[PDB]
Scaffold this active site. Structure first.
Site: not given
Ligand SMILES: Nc1nc2c(ncn2[C@@H]2O[C@H](COP(=O)(O)OP(=O)(O)OP(=O)(O)O)[C@@H](O)[C@H]2O)c(=O)[nH]1
Ligand SMILES: CC(=O)O[C@H]1C(=O)[C@@]2(C)[C@H]([C@H](OC(=O)c3ccccc3)[C@]3(O)C[C@H](OC(=O)[C@H](O)[C@@H](NC(=O)c4ccccc4)c4ccccc4)C(C)=C1C3(C)C)[C@]1(OC(C)=O)CO[C@@H]1C[C@@H]2O
Ligand SMILES: Nc1nc2c(ncn2[C@@H]2O[C@H](COP(=O)(O)OP(=O)(O)O)[C@@H](O)[C@H]2O)c(=O)[nH]1
Ligand SMILES: [Mg+2]
Lengths: 88, 433, 451
Positions: C12, C140, C144, C183, C206, C254
């Site tokens: 993300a 995010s 993980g 999560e 989201n 600020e």
């Molecule tokens: N707003 C937004 N959220 C995202 C996006 N891509 C993934 N997410 C969020 O990321 C969550 C999934 O976990 P990731 O952040 O992808 O975890 P990771 O970076 O793949 O790391 P690992 O868990 O080790 O694979 C989802 O529940 C989404 O809500 C994005 O492009 N935009």
């Protein structure tokens, strides 16, 4: 010399003003027993009166002693002291 | 030869200073490049009040610009009159105060104050007979308030016998742009009440009111507010630069306006003010200027004089006019509004007259009031300050920069004592016991 | 030189970084190769703003960003994409497995033996800067890597740099929809590190962004690209105060001085007012008052919570474009007279105002209409507690039966840490319930000498 004399005179004037106001407020309630708010006492106009705020005001008692000179030649001093001793 | 050193700290101070130097350069006929092209011969007679001479028959102002962020300096240099200032008077650093009074006063400003004082002392030593200093800043801000108070303290330590003015923009109840206004305003007033000979009360609310209701501007901006302020500052010290029938130095204003040492907060005003198309409908006479000066809506402080009593007022007229009209009008104003003037001063209206008016006007006038009503302003700040200090709303941001909880209490107590001192001469008798 | 360093951790974070760097490259006129023909045509200027782009001798501009992830694929996309020649070849992507939605894997087992390389490159970049302001970390919650590596990296950053601000943007998991079963665990364990080491953490949900996209832009089938573009717009509005001239500038200090009453409360909501399609851009004025009012509406919040159920403690408005101060003053005065918006009695002022001359730009292939005016609203309120509370309930429903716990302990964790983290969260909630309570009473009185 001029700066020292001017600052001393300003401090003396402020001290005399605060003591006069304190004495007037002392005299008034003492005979009238009223509480005309708390007046305003200009303590902050000089550091001398500011440090002595607790001793000057509130419950306290004060007394100023003034020295004179018997010589005729020093007339201008003695009379001047009287004009400061008459205050309050 | 009376000579004034100008200092400007912070964004607001720098902007007002730039507009002020524009106005003064127009009045003395100075080109943006620093040359002279004026017409009247009296413009060079007293040009040394604000300007030093330079080898190519040039003139350079005595301005000293200060700011802990370099953006405002870049804006000032890239402007109509940027080239006029000396490059060495642009004293600044990086990592600005960030609306934190502690950073401006203790942490960040303490390191730049030495350079600023070096420049100020260099300008001071070249002055034939220095009269006083000027400062422009905003109390409700970051770098401006703290560094202005620190510089005032240092200068009064170094130059005790010189006059010190201050055109400070104080916060407003309605028009508030920063959330920590009360702390900065309180801690700034705690220093200004002690280390300043004269302070002029300005706020954006009154200037916006003037722009809306007098000039009838649809979309005013900060330039117009700075224009009005600059008109006032130019009006205050007119008698030093041009001849007059009855001169009035800055020290004369200080002596006549200040009855006691701690009451030196003033309400400024300027006349005439008309909205372009209305200009033909109203004649310019001394009675009209007097009527507009004492009008409640013309004050630039958002304090109604009708809620108090005028301890003193001073008027500085510019233009060819009869002394009888001025004296008669001031006496009439005193007599008619007998309830709004303090009883234990026989005559509390100072008057001064200068022959030379502004460039495009026949007559003008500046008004400096000193009335009890200013206490209202301080009271309002106090009414907010405690409301944030009781719960310690944002206090840690200050205590992490070396400060202490006791100092806030001393500032509050000092402002409360000032408010009481103003309040005592405010009721219209004292007979009952 | 108001320089800032951007950190993108996790999938993300790096997609948000892609949409971001697209927006800034469009803003500064830098071509996707990394060159800038504007100076070549004009002959010189400051359009190579030092805030994000470091200028080399040849004229190329390299972004001040570090990408980090454990999955090689997501960064193999950008190593072979349009912007392949913009970034430095060092991308610090471990050719190994992923955290697999496990804090312990991303913090204790695999979070090691890559962190040294990361911190080394941040050291190099920070050495390259002069007058560095702070860090903008993107990640995010729930995921993980985005939890584990963010936690370890933030702990190390706090230990080394310390006094530099560390702003955080994160994807809080939504109330109803979710993309993983664990999560709540990762969120409830990373809340311990986000509370201490960060300085101001912004949260965006989201589901909320989906609702805004559906309502205002009339996009019935949105994807992550739209959400990332919106977040990039918000970050650009935040940072624009120190890149372009303005009537009232608001630096990053600020921000914290005006939005953070106490150290444990730095969780403000963020909103963007003039979100609207091209077709609906007409038939509307989009004046300052309209956008200011729309900023406060519950429907436009980027996190699924109702501000009406809490109280507004701090408020910061950042305007872009043809905005003059008097309209902002009028809008603030109008808002202050509304009863539906409640401000805490211990913040009489409430509002911070900033104005910038540079209007927002339009990304080709985007969805936001071209507008003259815009505003971004950052509000510290007590309603955010609700957004936490629901997740806590889910955590309980998972922790009573110790489900999915063996996966966490297998990588080097112990059970008690969960409880510890939970306790911390509970304490935070109590704080958010204690700050918003009204003052006791006048609590002090004086008599006017009644004798
Ligand atoms: N707003 C937004 N959220 C995202 C996006 N891509 C993934 N997410 C969020 O990321 C969550 C999934 O976990 P990731 O952040 O992808 O975890 P990771 O970076 O793949 O790391 P690992 O868990 O080790 O694979 C989802 O529940 C989404 O809500 C994005 O492009 N935009
Ligand atoms: C030519 C003429 O008769 O028209 C006037 C005019 O119409 C009015 C409305 C002028 C005009 O002022 C404004 O419109 C204005 C707008 C915002 C803020 C302040 C002023 C004028 O612009 C302003 C200008 O004033 C001056 O030139 C003074 O010298 C003034 N200096 C400046 O304004 C100045 C502007 C730019 C650069 C440098 C100087 C001044 C005032 C006090 C002390 C020293 C100098 C004048 C005569 C006029 C115009 C041109 C329309 C007024 O100006 C002042 C402050 O004296 C506003 O009300 C007065 C009364 C005038 O009738
Ligand atoms: N008259 C005027 N006031 C200003 C201007 N800019 C800011 N202010 C006022 O100053 C306050 C902000 O203080 P600031 O100038 O940022 O202090 P600084 O950061 O130390 O320079 C606001 O409450 C404004 O009302 C200006 O250009 N003109
Ligand atoms: Mg991943």
């Amino acid at each position: 010399r001029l700066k020292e004399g001017a600052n001393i005179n300003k401090s003396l004037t402020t001290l005399g003003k605060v003591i006069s106001a304190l004495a007037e407020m002392d005299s008034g309630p003492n005979k009238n027993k009223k509480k005309k708010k708390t007046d305003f006492i200009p303590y902050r106009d000089s550091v001398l009166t500011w440090l002595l705020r607790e001793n000057l005001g509130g419950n306290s008692r004060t007394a100023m002693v003034a020295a004179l000179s018997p010589a005729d030649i020093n007339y201008d001093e003695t009379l001047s002291t009287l004009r400061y001793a008459d205050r309050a | 030869m009376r000579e004034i050193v100008h200092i400007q700290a912070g964004q607001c101070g720098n902007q007002i200073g730039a507009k002020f130097w524009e106005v003064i350069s127009d009045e003395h006929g100075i080109d943006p490049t620093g040359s002279y092209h004026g017409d009247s011969d009296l413009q060079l007679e007293r040009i040394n009040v604000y300007y030093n001479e330079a080898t190519g028959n040039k003139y350079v102002p005595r301005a000293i610009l200060v700011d802990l962020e370099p953006g405002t300096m870049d804006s000032v240099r890239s402007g109509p009159f940027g080239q006029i200032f000396r490059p060495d008077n642009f004293v600044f650093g990086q990592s600005g105060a960030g609306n934190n009074w502690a950073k401006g006063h203790y942490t960040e400003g303490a390191e730049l104050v030495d350079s600023v004082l070096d420049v100020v002392r260099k300008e001071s030593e070249s002055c034939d007979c220095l009269q006083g200093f000027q400062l422009t800043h905003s109390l409700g801000g970051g770098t401006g308030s703290g560094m202005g108070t620190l510089l005032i303290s240092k200068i009064r330590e170094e130059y005790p016998d010189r006059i010190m003015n201050t055109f400070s923009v104080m916060p407003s109840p309605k028009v508030s742009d920063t959330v920590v206004e009360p702390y900065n305003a309180t801690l700034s007033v705690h220093q200004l009440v002690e280390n300043t000979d004269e302070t002029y009360c300005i706020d954006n609310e009154a200037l916006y009111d003037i722009c809306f209701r007098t000039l009838k501007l649809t979309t005013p901006t900060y330039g117009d507010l700075n224009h009005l302020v600059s008109a006032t500052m130019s009006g205050v010290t007119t008698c030093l630069r041009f001849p007059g029938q009855l001169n009035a130095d800055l020290r004369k204003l200080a002596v006549n306006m200040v009855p006691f040492p701690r009451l030196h907060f003033f309400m400024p005003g300027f006349a005439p003010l008309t909205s372009r198309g209305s200009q033909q409908y109203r004649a310019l006479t001394v009675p009209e200027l007097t009527q507009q000066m004492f009008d409640s809506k013309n004050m630039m402080a958002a304090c109604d004089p009708r809620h108090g009593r005028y301890l003193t007022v001073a008027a500085i007229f510019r233009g060819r006019m009869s002394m009888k009209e001025v004296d008669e009008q001031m006496l009439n104003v005193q007599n008619k509004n007998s309830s709004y003037f303090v009883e234990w001063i026989p005559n509390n209206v100072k008057t001064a007259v200068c022959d030379i008016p502004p460039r495009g006007l026949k007559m003008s006038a500046t008004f400096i009031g000193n009335s009890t009503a200013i206490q209202e302003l301080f009271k309002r700040i106090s009414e907010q300050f405690t409301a944030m200090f009781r719960r310690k709303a944002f206090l840690h941001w200050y205590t992490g920069e070396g400060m202490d909880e006791m100092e806030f209490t001393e500032a509050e107590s000092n402002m409360n004592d000032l408010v009481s001192e103003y309040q005592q001469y405010q009721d219209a008798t004292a007979d009952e016991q | 030189m108001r320089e800032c360093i951007s950190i993108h951790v996790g999938q993300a974070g790096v997609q948000i970084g892609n949409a971001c760097w697209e927006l800034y490259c469009l803003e500064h006129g830098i071509q996707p190769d990394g060159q800038m023909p504007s100076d070549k045509t004009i002959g010189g200027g400051d359009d190579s703003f030092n805030t994000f782009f470091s200028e080399t001798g040849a004229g190329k501009h390299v972004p001040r960003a570090v990408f980090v992830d454990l999955e090689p694929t997501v960064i193999d996309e950008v190593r072979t994409g349009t912007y392949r020649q913009l970034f430095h070849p060092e991308q610090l992507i471990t050719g190994k497995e992923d955290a697999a939605n496990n804090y312990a894997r991303g913090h204790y087992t695999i979070g090691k033996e890559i962190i040294d390389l990361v911190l080394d490159r941040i050291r190099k970049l920070a050495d390259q800067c002069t007058g560095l302001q702070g860090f903008l970390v993107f990640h995010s919650f729930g995921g993980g890597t985005g939890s584990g590596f963010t936690s370890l990296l933030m702990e190390r950053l706090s230990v080394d740099y310390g006094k530099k601000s560390k702003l955080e943007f994160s994807i809080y998991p939504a109330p109803q929809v979710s993309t993983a079963v664990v999560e709540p665990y990762n969120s409830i364990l990373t809340t311990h590190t986000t509370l201490e080491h960060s300085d101001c953490a912004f949260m965006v949900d989201n589901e909320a962004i989906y609702d805004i996209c559906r309502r205002n832009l009339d996009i019935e089938r949105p994807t992550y690209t739209n959400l990332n573009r919106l977040i990039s717009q918000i970050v650009s509005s935040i940072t624009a105060s120190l890149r372009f001239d303005g009537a009232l500038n608001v630096d990053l200090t600020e921000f914290q001085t005006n939005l953070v009453p106490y150290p444990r409360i730095h969780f403000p909501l963020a909103t963007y007012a003039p979100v609207i399609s091209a077709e609906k851009a007409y038939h509307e004025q989009l004046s300052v008052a309209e956008i200011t009012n729309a900023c406060f509406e519950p429907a436009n919040q980027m996190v699924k919570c109702d501000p009406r159920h809490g109280k507004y403690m701090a408020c910061c408005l950042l305007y872009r474009g043809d905005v003059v101060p008097k309209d902002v003053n009028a809008a603030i005065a109008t808002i202050k007279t509304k009863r539906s918006i409640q401000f805490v009695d211990w913040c009489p002022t409430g509002f911070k105002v900033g104005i910038n001359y540079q209007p927002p730009t339009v990304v080709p292939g985007g969805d936001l209409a071209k507008v003259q005016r815009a505003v971004c609203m950052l509000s510290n309120t007590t309603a955010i507690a609700e957004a936490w509370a629901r997740l806590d309930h889910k955590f309980d429903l998972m922790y009573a039966k110790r489900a999915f716990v063996h996966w966490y302990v297998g990588e080097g964790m112990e059970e008690g840490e969960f409880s510890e983290a939970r306790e911390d969260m509970a304490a935070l909630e109590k704080d958010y319930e204690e700050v918003g309570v009204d003052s006791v009473e006048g609590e002090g009185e004086e008599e006017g000498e009644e004798y």
